[PDB]
RNA sequence: CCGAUAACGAACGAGACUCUGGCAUGCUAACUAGUUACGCGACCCCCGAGCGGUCGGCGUCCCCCAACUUCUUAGAGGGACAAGUGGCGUUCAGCCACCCGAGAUUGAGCAAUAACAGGUCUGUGAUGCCCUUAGAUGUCCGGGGCUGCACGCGCGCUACACUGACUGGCUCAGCGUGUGCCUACCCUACGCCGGCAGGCGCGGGUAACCCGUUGAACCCCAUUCGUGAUGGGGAUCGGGGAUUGCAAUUAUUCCCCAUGAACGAGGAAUUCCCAGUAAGUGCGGGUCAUAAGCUUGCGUUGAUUAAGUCCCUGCCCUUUGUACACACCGCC
């Protein structure tokens, strides 16, 4: 155990998710690369995590309205 | 006081050879890369030496 | 399980009775036949190789903590 | 050849003043005498030339007094000076070594003239405790009480 | 007056008991009779599908 | 054909209860050449059970400090011993090897916890993994200390730990303590 | 039957152990240091470094030339690493020169067999704590 | 070198001087708004840099 | 069909080195054979009066494998542990008064020298018996 | 964190972060790391292997006289994210199982608001106040002492044995140190003498260049022992010899021959611990003129049991009571 998301990644992939829904997808890679450009994150670590959580709101949000 | 037995007693080896270069101290000394250093000095002036605790 | 007094060396009743029973159960490590026979074991040891010498038993695995025998193979 | 054990067979035998086994083999039964450890036991038998396999109880009698002159008269056989007990010696400065009640002699000498001489060791030895100058505030309360 | 040792199959983990997690409540369908399932208090670490020996067959198991 | 110790094929053994058929390693794919392979069977929850049990069993040997890493030792204790019950009896040291295990579980066991006020032992069944596990570690401390002070080698008290286990005739310390675990239970159900 | 320039070199390590085996085109023979896999320390565990040719057999041994150096470690974790270290060599020279279709249905047996024949194992040690005599054991401590 | 020291040792030598001159300074230039000190090491020389508040002074 | 000393067992070959030493009357040995131990952290003298030779068939292949070796690397080599009594044990390094007449006696025998550099080296006609016995060794036990 | 929700949005701490471990036959490169290929050899051979086998033998930056970074070093990057699947779950946060993967929880470091009259004036030319200050509690020298033992306690090491001890042989590491402002003190190869501790002369090294391919122990292979307080144990003690020091007695240490004490798995109780972990087993550093049973690291061999709970012991939160607020060591 011990997979949870902190608020700081769940917080920025809600931001991110709004201000480019379009250019983000379904793909892991292809969300972890757009995420590399259009935000400034220091670290790679908290960068695939963003991405993750980016990667499982697209599928919520492709099959229901979520709170973003 | 008289020079013959002032300084007659040698010390050319031993704990009393060595002291601290910041406090004369002759405890906890670390002689180790020619350091000579009293410990807790070392411990005080590690960082303007260049020691740092990665881990 | 007061003492042992195992023999150093055969005698008149022990050295018959191993040169007539020995090759004959299917163990036969010098351990086994020490307690069997009372014997030292040290004995056991130089008892045991002369008999393979003899060609009485043949031998199994041959290794530094224990050497196994048994007995020939009836035909 | 690993056979029974001999007719000439000494289960139990004296040698010098007192016992030794006899099941066991020739060098680790020897050392039973007050004054031989596994070393001496094996240097002497070696220069005495004979067997190491067989036990004490398969020593004929001249096999006895060759190994009993041997570790009576050792500097006399090329056994080293440096080998021996009462090594150039309080005494006598005479290289020697010390058998069964001999060596009793010889260690009950040294303590009584420590006693005598009222060195700081043999005052230890008087009043029953260490000499080696080992500590003896939390050990040794077993052989006092 | 003894009666038969069978065995029993693992469905489904209730849960630990015994005041310190030793024990664990199992859901348990004896495969002469797939039709009764009782609840056994098992001892060590029980997986679901596996089975597992009962040397009887009216004893439940309560709490603790 | 995989021939563990060069011989002793693991193709025709067979487990009698399915209840540790589903939990020994014996089998074809878990068929080894050695009882050796550091594969990391105790990183995560029922792995043990698909390593093999003859790496069980050395595992489980080498006990009580002077001999707590030492495997080759226990390799070539299982080896002379597997020759030992193979001379002596003359049928597949692996299947006697199975046999010893399933007389030696325990199939009840108390838990000692019944009551809070006063100590009850409510009696209680024993889990496959548990039963096992029980059962080699009584073979193994059998071994212990059946050779403790005694000319007796420690394959060889093994090997007869194994056998009357394996035979049940009683005067094992497996059976004697197994059983000693049923009649408390009964005692106390 | 001539062709040159056929040779590949795969590493392999278990715990600071790591063993080059070179692998090139030749008659079927094998060498570890110099001496034979037979002639090895721990022979009790022969059986293991007999074991990756006994599961292909020597025909897709016999012909190949592959020598071992090995480094580091002990006893086993040598052994263990020559082990892989064999069976990626092989199977590496074989993808190199001839189809992986005919790699691959001996990969399959080597992995279903022992994945540590192919992957080396992550684990290695861990660091010793001030606050006892090893990694995580810590000293005794008494209140009275 | 023999005559030279271990490349260890002379970073430790280089790091005690930097840790006493900047104490040395410390306690000189206590009331003097003193900051901190940098220095670079040359073959050809060695340069010291006080950084303070109050240069003028 | 050749053999190499490195393609047969090192625990045979050892002893039939020595046995060839034993009949080759050339090597040389010293009178304190029967009276020293072989090492600081040895509490009794070797059980075969035979050990120089056991010795010096040891040294011999240690030489044929790697050269430059000298006195200091042969007890470092020969080296065991101390049980210390009541300390924990360590690390005991051999004689080196013994390995020095090893070395000294084989060089008698004139099949090892001095290096250019310190330690000594086998020579043609040295690793040339040592492959020879190894050979015979070798077909023996084969067969 | 998700969720109900008079709250919404934040900040510290946790996290995140740095270092470290495992993977990249991907890039960058190396005579202070090397690897394949080749030329000489040396030996094995020759029955015939001959594109034969071994070489830590010598050379191919001896610079024109081969390539390359797989192995080593270390930079820049990548790589893992519960990402894929299935199941459970409010179907949310998540949990579990599995494929593929090097890795599906690597260890540490740092670390909140505050409290403990917690420990340190004997770390300091940090320090207030008091004491002493020439018959000195300043300071130096010499000797003794910090070790001293009717006893109790704690941390440990050595063992109680045959899963062993001894004898011999085979035999694989990784941390990391190494010649000094004061400061006279380094790691040491080889050769010779000595049985050993050691001694003598040449060397090398301020170091991926030398020690050093760190030829470590355990373990492995053979012989002996044989259940005997025995070849376990090496306590105690006698004699002798070397190293260091101005000095070895109250034994510095080390070496050899002696004697061989309790101890046969330890009561009530009690400590530490979940994967390269425990545990055995050595080796470095710190201490050092001399030196580790200590400590801190490193490596080797390497498991049993569990994936749970509040029963015990502690700790935290909520509720509750208060005549406490210097806050229960309280008030009275
Ligand atoms: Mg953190
Ligand atoms: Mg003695």
């Keep these: 155990m011990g997979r949870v998301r902190t608020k700081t990644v769940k917080k920025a992939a809600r931001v991110i998710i709004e201000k480019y829904y379009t250019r983000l997808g379904n793909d892991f890679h292809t969300n972890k690369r757009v995420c590399e450009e259009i935000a400034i994150i220091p670290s790679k670590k908290l960068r695939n995590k963003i991405a993750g959580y980016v990667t499982h709101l697209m599928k919520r949000i492709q099959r229901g309205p979520v709170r973003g | ?55 | 399980r007061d003492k042992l007094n195992n023999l150093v060396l055969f005698d008149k009743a022990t050295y018959d009775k191993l040169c007539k029973e020995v090759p004959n159960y299917k163990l036969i490590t010098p351990a086994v036949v020490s307690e069997r026979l009372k014997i030292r074991g040290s004995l056991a040891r130089a008892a045991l190789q002369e008999l393979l010498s003899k060609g009485l038993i043949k031998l199994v695995s041959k290794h530094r903590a224990q050497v196994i025998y048994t007995r020939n193979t009836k035909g | 050849m690993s056979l029974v054990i001999p007719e000439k067979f000494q289960h139990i035998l004296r040698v010098l003043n007192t016992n030794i086994d006899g099941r066991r083999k020739i060098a680790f039964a020897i050392t039973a005498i007050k004054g031989v450890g596994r070393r001496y036991a094996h240097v002497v038998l070696r220069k005495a030339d004979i067997d190491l396999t067989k036990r004490a109880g398969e020593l004929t009698e001249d096999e006895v007094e060759r190994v009993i002159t041997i570790m009576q008269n050792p500097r006399q056989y090329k056994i080293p000076d440096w080998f021996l007990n009462r090594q150039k010696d309080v005494k006598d400065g005479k290289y020697s070594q010390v058998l069964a009640n001999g060596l009793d002699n010889k260690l009950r000498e040294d303590l009584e003239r420590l006693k005598k001489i009222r060195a700081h060791r043999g005052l230890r030895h008087f009043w029953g405790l260490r000499v080696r100058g080992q500590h003896t505030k939390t050990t040794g309360r077993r052989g006092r009480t | ?64 | 054909d995989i021939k563990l110790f060069g011989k002793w094929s693991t193709d025709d053994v067979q487990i009698n209860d399915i209840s540790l058929q589903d939990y020994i390693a014996v089998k074809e794919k878990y068929a080894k050449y050695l009882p050796h392979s550091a594969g990391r069977y105790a990183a995560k929850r029922f792995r043990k059970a698909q390593c093999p049990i003859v790496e069980r069993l050395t595992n489980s040997m080498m006990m009580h400090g002077r001999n707590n890493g030492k495997k080759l030792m226990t390799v070539r204790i299982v080896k002379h011993a597997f020759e030992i019950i193979h001379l002596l009896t003359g049928e597949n040291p692996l299947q006697v090897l199975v046999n010893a295990i399933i007389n030696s579980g325990p199939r009840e066991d108390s838990t000692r916890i019944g009551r809070a006020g006063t100590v009850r032992r409510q009696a209680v069944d024993v889990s496959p993994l548990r039963r096992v596990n029980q059962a080699i570690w009584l073979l193994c401390t059998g071994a212990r200390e059946a050779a403790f002070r005694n000319i007796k080698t420690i394959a060889e008290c093994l090997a007869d730990e194994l056998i009357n286990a394996a035979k049940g005739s009683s005067n094992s310390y497996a059976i004697k303590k197994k059983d000693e675990l049923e009649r408390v239970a009964k005692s106390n159900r | ?144 | 070198m023999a005559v030279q020291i271990s490349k260890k040792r002379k970073f430790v030598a280089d790091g005690i001087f930097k840790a006493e001159l900047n104490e040395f300074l410390t306690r000189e230039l206590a009331e003097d708004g003193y900051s901190g000190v940098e220095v670079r090491v040359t073959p050809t020389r060695t340069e010291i840099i006080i950084l303070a508040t109050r240069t003028q002074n | 069909p050749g053999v190499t000393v490195k393609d047969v067992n090192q625990q045979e070959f050892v002893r039939a080195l020595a046995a060839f030493l034993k009949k080759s009357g050339k090597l040389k040995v010293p009178e304190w054979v029967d009276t020293v131990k072989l090492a600081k952290h040895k509490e009794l003298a070797p059980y075969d009066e035979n050990w120089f030779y056991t010795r010096a068939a040891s040294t011999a292949r240690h030489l044929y494998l790697r050269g430059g070796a000298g006195v200091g690397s042969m007890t470092k080599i020969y080296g065991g542990r101390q049980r210390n009594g009541v300390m924990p044990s360590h690390f005991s390094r051999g004689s080196k008064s013994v390995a020095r007449r090893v070395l000294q006696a084989l060089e008698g025998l004139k099949m090892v020298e001095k290096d250019q550099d310190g330690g000594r080296k086998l020579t043609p006609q040295g690793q040339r018996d040592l492959d020879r016995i190894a050979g015979q060794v070798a077909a023996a036990n084969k067969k």
Aim: with cysteine; charged share 30%; proline share 3%.
């Design chain 7, 1 to 144: 039957s001539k062709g040159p320039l056929q040779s590949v070199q795969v590493f392999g390590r278990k715990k600071t152990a790591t063993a080059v085996a070179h692998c090139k085109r030749g008659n079927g023979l094998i060498k570890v240091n110099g001496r034979p896999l037979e002639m090895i320390e721990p022979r009790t565990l022969q059986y293991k470094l007999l074991e990756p040719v006994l599961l292909l057999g020597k025909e897709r041994f016999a012909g190949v030339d592959i020598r071992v150096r090995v480094k580091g470690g002990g006893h086993v974790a040598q052994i263990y690493a020559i082990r892989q270290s064999i069976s990626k060599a092989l199977v590496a020279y074989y993808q190199k020169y001839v189809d992986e279709a005919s790699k691959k249905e001996i990969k399959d047996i080597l992995i279903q067999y022992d994945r540590t024949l192919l992957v080396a194992d992550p684990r290695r040690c861990e660091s010793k704590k001030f606050g006892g005599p090893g990694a995580r054991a810590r000293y005794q401590k008494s209140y009275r």
């Design chain 5, 1 to 64: 007056r003894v009666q038969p040792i069978k065995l029993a199959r693992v469905t489904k983990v209730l849960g630990r008991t015994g005041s310190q997690g030793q024990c664990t409540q199992v859901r348990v369908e004896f495969m002469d009779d797939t039709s009764r399932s009782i609840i056994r208090n098992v001892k060590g670490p029980v997986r679901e599908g596996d089975v597992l020996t009962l040397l009887e067959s009216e004893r439940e198991a309560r709490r603790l």
């Design chain 2, 1 to 55: 006081g008289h020079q013959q037995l002032y300084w007659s007693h040698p010390r050319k080896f031993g704990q009393g050879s060595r002291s601290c270069r910041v406090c004369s101290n002759r405890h906890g000394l670390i002689r180790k890369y020619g350091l000579n250093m009293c410990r807790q000095c070392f411990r005080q002036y590690a960082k303007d030496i260049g020691f740092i605790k990665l881990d």
